[PDB]
Write a protein that binds this ligand. Structure first.
Ligand SMILES: [Hg+2]
Ligand SMILES: [Hg+2]
Ligand SMILES: [Hg+2]
Ligand SMILES: [Hg+2]
Ligand SMILES: [Zn+2]
Length: 1028
């Protein structure tokens, strides 16, 4: 009907004493640069917040007149907290030195502004030390961090917030005591004020309510600096707005004034140089706002996923006794490294698409592809031009690099930009980059460092003793993967997201629907019964090493899968008839959704940045596709065209909700006795529970997920006419693996080792040594050849099955296609690149972690490897391919893939591909008949892994007057006529209720009278179900 959400502050400042154990773990999940006392850590119940922590909340944003009532706006807590005091207690994500310095100069190189606290405000700063004093904590054995709602983190750093020192309380995290001071909006003291406050320290501002006791803004430098860098920066870069402070204020504007449409980004935002190019520029700011606005919507929304709880992470199970549970976490994050690697080296990654290009119209005709994002990491140095294409001020002189080609440079400065010029985040970036380059086609770190002493190094960030971990070195090691932007045409976006749905359509034939999904499930069930497979690990042999011991076993296994598949297909199709076959499959496509839920992201500020950046790109893309229609037949050069039409661009975007690509939902907020600071007693006095107010806007409408789909059925999909080699055929994997068992005396002349390669080669050319084949081998070879021939005749999946799981699904798919008379072309396939991890495969891979870096570098490395177990963060990414997605998606994984949005006014998220070839990922193969996904499992690590007495005795609980009826049904829908066998004892067990059991006994009896003495229906359900 209507959803509820508790009124609360916009955030809290958590303060606790330095824990002394699970810190090493917290650090791994966190992001922290070794040269700074600040850090950003993930929001994790039991780690950074107490257990009853409630993410969704209606924050007190202001006050109204008519007596003063409060204003509340819903929002949720940001997926990560911000440590502004105590970062020193967290091991740096990297040994990389002077990241703070590197960011500083990189920021100046690309034209972005730096955090600059006003001199006249310092006297009002609230220092960590100061708070530690009030809280009675040791300034050197203490941690202070901000826990905020997504909608006001920006409000905090522009000093539009204040601490309610009187509302202090304590909570427990892991048995430890933790203090927390609630944070509120200064606007509270300004009735009917929805604007951002400039000069928040002016206690005499006219908008302040009279006789009110204006509080002291909560101004902390380390904090404000970290937010600017870790929260405002990424957006600043993403929405190409070099005046960072301005960006922060634009977000605050959207958070304080729900009714705000029109311009938000600075009115004088500049533009990277590379009628006239006037519209191009305009389309970018408008899309820029479009995106900033859309993201705000999602920030003021309320999602269903709860904040992660470390004590729920199956990742610890068993390997969690010793404090060396840290390894589990270390090995986990290492997998992700492989994904972040792709997000940095894919030439079309969201992290790079920061500029917009005008391809011109296709003259009033639609132009949904005129404007689009292009990579601009290599051009962020070009001159900044204004609205009218004129260079601004300090940009005169700068060389303007070309958008395509040219000899590009990808140095530390750039890496820093991708991470919003935040050294804290950049650190976590390197942490992952350091776990990358699972190269097998190619640098000697040790040799490099050695031959570099006092040799004049091109880097003023490191020294001989630190070269092993310095950015420049790491980038040197990954040089081959560096992004070379050479494409000029509009491309797909390389997004990082997490498919958190319990449901997906990535079966070999996608969503072709009993339904097709059901069938594949039963077959997989059946195969598991035969013990030929492990539904969760397709790659598993599951008892096959035992079953297949004689060539007669082969016969039976092949016949069983063939048989169970034919049986289930025979059924599914027959049912579908009792639907249009030919038309139905040419329509079905593979599908998956990417959540926009802030708590479905990984437990790391970096993995979070990636998702946030991705979504921003996706929003701009959408905004962009509507710009041309917005300009059409309008004097587009008007002084403030932006404020005049943004409202429209905005609306055209909102219109996309539930229209093909953007899945959206609506929530109605229930109105109302409210505890909140006193508008008079001061921020020190206790909370005033007198206030009674509601939510300004009762209706919430926001994006929920991204619908990505890829057409299954289809030039290059032409099934070659040539026959397939038996060894590369449907049974190739089995024949090779169990050759010795099937063909015992199958070893060649000379060797005493049964070699399948040799055997089947000679067997197929007649070059097989005269009369070798047993009397019974011929029957098997025959059997083999026929299956291979039959399957081949109907096969349209251009991939060789690698295990029984795939063998059954492909065969089943091929059988369904044969039923529909499919012909000529191969179908489209999906391949997952599973992200895994392992201990460093060499000393080389540990270079950057050696504790000794000078002449003792290579020894330090070796020592590190010698005691690998002691280093919980000493892991490395590796990849594995999988052509069976069902299991993959079951793990509700974090993913990285190419996404191309088409707008025809519907939207469709076309599954595209990552550019940069093997550089984005070495396992990526160019082939237009297949699509890929880099995937890192979640379920089984940071999520629960992939019961009637319960369901029944669950209805007996949350149930009304028809419990009897409801329960009878469930029992029947879980037991056929079996229900009739149940005696009073059986019932009393299924329901620990005597009354109910007797009722069940009366029902069961009546249903028998209906069938005259032959069980069947439950019309008696509805009949009794009358108690209304
Ligand atoms: Hg400590
Ligand atoms: Hg209270
Ligand atoms: Hg798999
Ligand atoms: Hg990969
Ligand atoms: Zn260096």
């Amino acid at each position: 009907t209507t959803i509820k959400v508790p009124p609360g502050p916009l955030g809290y400042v958590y303060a606790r004493a330095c824990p002394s154990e699970g810190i090493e773990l917290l650090a791994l999940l966190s992001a922290r640069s070794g040269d700074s006392d600040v850090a950003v850590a993930p929001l994790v119940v039991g780690l950074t917040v107490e257990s009853g922590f409630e993410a969704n909340v209606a924050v007190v944003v202001g006050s109204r007149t008519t007596a003063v009532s409060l204003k509340l706006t819903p929002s949720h807590y940001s997926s990560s907290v911000y440590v502004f005091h105590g970062g020193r207690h967290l091991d740096p994500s990297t040994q990389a030195p002077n990241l703070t310095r590197l960011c500083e100069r990189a920021r100046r190189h690309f034209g972005f502004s730096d955090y600059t606290p006003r001199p006249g405000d310092l006297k009002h700063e609230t220092t960590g030390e100061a708070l530690c004093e009030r809280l009675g904590l040791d300034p050197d054995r203490a941690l202070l961090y901000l826990v905020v709602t997504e909608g006001f983190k920006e409000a905090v750093c522009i000093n539009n917030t204040f601490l309610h020192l009187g509302g202090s309380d304590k909570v427990t995290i892991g048995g430890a005591e933790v203090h927390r001071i609630p944070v509120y909006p200064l606007q509270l003291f300004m009735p009917d004020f929805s604007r951002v406050i400039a000069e928040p320290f002016n206690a005499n501002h006219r908008s302040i309510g009279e006789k009110f006791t204006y509080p002291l803004p909560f101004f902390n430098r380390p904090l404000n600096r970290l937010l600017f860098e870790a929260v405002v920066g990424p957006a600043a870069v993403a929405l190409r707005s070099r005046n960072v402070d301005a960006v922060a204020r634009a977000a605050a504007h959207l958070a304080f004034d729900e009714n705000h449409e029109g311009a938000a980004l600075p009115a004088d935002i500049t533009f990277t140089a590379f009628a006239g190019g006037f519209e191009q520029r305009l389309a970018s700011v408008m899309a820029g706002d479009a995106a900033l606005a859309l993201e705000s919507i999602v920030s003021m929304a309320v999602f269903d996923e709860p904040p992660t709880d470390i004590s729920a992470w199956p990742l610890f199970e068993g390997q969690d006794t010793a404090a060396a549970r840290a390894n589990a976490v270390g090995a986990y994050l290492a997998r992700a490294a492989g994904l972040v690697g792709a997000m940095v080296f894919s030439t079309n990654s969201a992290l790079h698409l920061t500029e917009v290009d005008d391809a011109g119209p296709a003259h009033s005709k639609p132009s949904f592809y005129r404007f689009f994002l292009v990579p601009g990491t290599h051009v962020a140095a070009n001159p900044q031009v204004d609205r009218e294409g004129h260079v601004v001020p300090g940009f005169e002189g700068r060389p303007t690099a070309p958008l395509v080609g040219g000899t590009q440079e990808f140095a530390g400065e750039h890496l820093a930009m991708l991470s919003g010029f935040s050294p804290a985040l950049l650190a976590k970036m390197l942490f992952y980059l350091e776990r990358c380059d699972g190269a097998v086609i190619v640098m000697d770190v040790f040799r490099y460092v050695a031959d570099s002493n006092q040799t004049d190094v091109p880097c003023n960030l490191c020294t001989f003793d630190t070269r092993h971990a310095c950015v420049h070195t790491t980038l040197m090691r990954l040089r081959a993967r560096h992004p070379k932007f050479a494409s000029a045409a509009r491309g797909a976006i390389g997004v990082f997201g997490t498919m958190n749905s319990m449901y997906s359509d990535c079966d070999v034939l996608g969503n072709y629907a009993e339904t097709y999904r059901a069938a594949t499930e039963r077959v997989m069930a059946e195969l598991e019964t035969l013990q030929y497979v492990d539904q969760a690990v397709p790659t598993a042999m599951g008892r096959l090493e035992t079953i297949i011991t004689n060539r007669e076993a082969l016969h039976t296994v092949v016949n069983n899968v063939r048989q169970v598949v034919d049986r289930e297909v025979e059924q599914l199709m027959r049912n579908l008839v009792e639907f249009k076959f030919r038309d139905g499959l040419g329509e079905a496509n593979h599908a998956m959704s990417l959540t926009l839920d802030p708590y479905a992201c990984g437990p790391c500020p970096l993995l979070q940045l990636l998702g946030r950046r991705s979504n921003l790109a996706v929003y701009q893309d959408l905004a962009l596709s509507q710009c041309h229609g917005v300009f059409a037949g309008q004097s587009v050069e008007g002084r403030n065209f932006r404020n005049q039409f943004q409202p429209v661009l905005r609306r055209r975007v909102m219109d996309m909700f539930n229209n093909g690509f953007l899945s959206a939902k609506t929530l109605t907020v229930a109105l109302s006795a409210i505890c909140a600071p006193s508008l008079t007693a001061g921020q020190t006095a206790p909370a005033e529970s007198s206030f009674e107010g509601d939510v300004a806007r009762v209706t919430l409408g926001f994006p929920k997920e991204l619908r990505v789909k890829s057409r299954v059925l289809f030039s290059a999909y032409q099934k070659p006419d040539k026959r397939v080699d038996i060894l590369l055929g449907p049974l190739g994997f089995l024949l090779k693996q169990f050759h010795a068992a099937i063909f015992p005396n199958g070893k060649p002349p000379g060797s005493n080792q049964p070699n399948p390669q040799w055997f089947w080669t000679a067997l197929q050319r007649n070059q097989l040594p005269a009369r070798l084949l047993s009397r019974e081998d011929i029957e098997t070879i025959a059997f083999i050849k026929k299956f291979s021939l039959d399957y081949g005749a109907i096969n349209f999946i251009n991939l060789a099955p690698n295990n029984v799981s795939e063998l059954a699904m492909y065969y089943m798919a091929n059988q369904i296609l044969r039923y529909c008379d499919h012909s000529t072309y191969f179908i489209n396939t999906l391949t997952a690149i599973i992200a895994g991890s392992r201990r460093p495969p060499s000393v080389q891979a540990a270079a950057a972690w050696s504790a000794q870096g000078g002449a003792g570098l290579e020894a330090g490395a070796r020592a590190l490897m010698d005691a690998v177990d002691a280093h919980p963060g000493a892991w490395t990414s590796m990849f594995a391919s999988c052509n069976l997605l069902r299991p993959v998606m079951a793990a509700r994984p974090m993913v990285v893939l190419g996404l191309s949005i088409s707008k025809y006014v519907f939207q469709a998220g076309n599954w595209a591909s990552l550019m940069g070839g093997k550089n984005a990922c070495p396992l990526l193969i160019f082939d237009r008949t297949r699509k890929f996904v880099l995937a890192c499992p979640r379920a089984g690590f940071v999520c629960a892994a992939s019961s009637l007495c319960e369901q029944l005795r669950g209805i007996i609980s949350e149930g009304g007057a028809a419990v009897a009826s409801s329960v009878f049904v469930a029992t029947v829908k879980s037991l056929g006529p079996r229900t009739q066998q149940l005696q009073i004892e059986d019932w009393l067990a299924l329901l620990e209720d005597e009354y109910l059991s007797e009722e069940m006994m009366e029902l069961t009896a009546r249903a028998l009278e209906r069938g005259n003495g032959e069980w069947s229906t439950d019309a008696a359900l509805e009949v009794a179900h009358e108690a209304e």
